[PDB]
Amino acid sequence: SQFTDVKCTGSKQCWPVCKQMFGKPNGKCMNGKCRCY
């Protein structure tokens, strides 16, 4: 997992975040913050 500080309630929210931050959308909302894979 890659850490982010981006808050979230649902995993789909994390897809654009992870795409911007790490180059792929694969990501889940984990304990209220995005994690990217």
Side-chain angles (χ1 to χ4, degrees), residues 4-25 27-37:
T4 81
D5 228 27
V6 176
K7 296 172 180 88
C8 57
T9 52
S11 291
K12 275 189 194 209
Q13 296 181 307
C14 299
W15 295 352
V17 165
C18 293
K19 182 51 182 187
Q20 288 188 339
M21 292 184 69
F22 298 97
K24 289 185 303 196
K28 292 176 179 184
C29 191
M30 299 302 263
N31 191 41
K33 294 178 190 256
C34 294
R35 297 236 138 225
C36 309
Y37 300 96

